[PDB]
């Protein structure tokens, strides 16, 4: 599985969903997650993220390990997203800010 980590929060560019062959992104108010059962690990999404927030599960930084289980839990509750949409309004003010998990919305 590929994992969305911290920098997606409050950026949510959605560029990643275009390239996904299996449509395994689920949508929340200010973050996207990849559903781990569904991902086929084709890695096509991780060059597409402008926030460079996607990682192979096995490459998630040490300090972002929480995101692996978080993607798995929220994918079960959040709706499937299959079409790109516009980035959140202030997405590049927040792009690159560390510690955005305190801002996540369910
Ligand atoms: S690695 Fe592939 S299947 Fe997995 S979310 Fe990314 S683009 Fe979709
Ligand atoms: S910011 Fe998020 S919505 Fe996709 S393109 Fe990057 S993982």
Curated annotation (Swiss-Prot):
Record's cofactor remark: Binds 1 [4Fe-4S] cluster.
Amino acids binding [4Fe-4S] cluster: 20, 39, 42, 45
UniProt keywords, alphabetically: 3Fe-4S, 4Fe-4S, DNA-binding, Electron transport, Iron, Iron-sulfur, Metal-binding, Repeat, Transport
Pfam family membership, one: DUF3470
GO molecular function, one term: metal ion binding
Coiled-coil segments: none
Gene3D superfamilies associated with the record: 3.30.70.20
Signal sequence, start to end: none
Origin: domain of life: Bacteria
Keyword Repeat: yes
Keyword presence, Iron: yes
Cofactor(s) listed in the protein's UniProt record: [4Fe-4S] cluster; [3Fe-4S] cluster
Binding-site residues for [3Fe-4S] cluster, renumbered to this chain: 8, 16, 49
UniProt-listed InterPro entries: 4Fe4S_Fe-S-bd, 4Fe4S_Fe_S_CS, 7Fe_ferredoxin, Fd_C, FdxA, RnfB_subfamily
Biased composition (Basic and acidic residues): 95-106
Region of interest called Disordered, as start-end residue ranges on this chain: 83-106
Domain 4Fe-4S ferredoxin-type: 1-29, 30-59
SUPFAM superfamilies from the UniProt entry: 4Fe-4S ferredoxins (SSF54862)
Job of this protein: Ferredoxins are iron-sulfur proteins that transfer electrons in a wide variety of metabolic reactions. This ferredoxin could play a role in regulating gene expression by interacting directly with DNA.
Protein name, as recorded: Ferredoxin-1
Species in which this protein is naturally found: Azotobacter vinelandii
């Amino acid at each position: 599985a590929y994992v969305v980590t911290d920098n997606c929060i409050k950026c949510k560019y959605t560029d990643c969903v275009e390239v996904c062959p299996v449509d395994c992104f689920y949508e929340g108010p200010n973050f996207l997650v990849i559903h781990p059962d569904e991902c086929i690990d084709c890695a096509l999404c991780e060059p597409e993220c402008p926030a460079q927030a996607i990682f192979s599960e096995d490459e998630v930084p040490e300090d972002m390990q929480e995101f692996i289980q978080l993607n798995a839990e929220l994918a079960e509750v959040w709706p499937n997203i299959t079409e790109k949409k516009d980035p959140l309004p202030d997405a590049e003010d927040w792009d690159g800010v560390k510690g955005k998990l305190q801002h996540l919305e369910r």
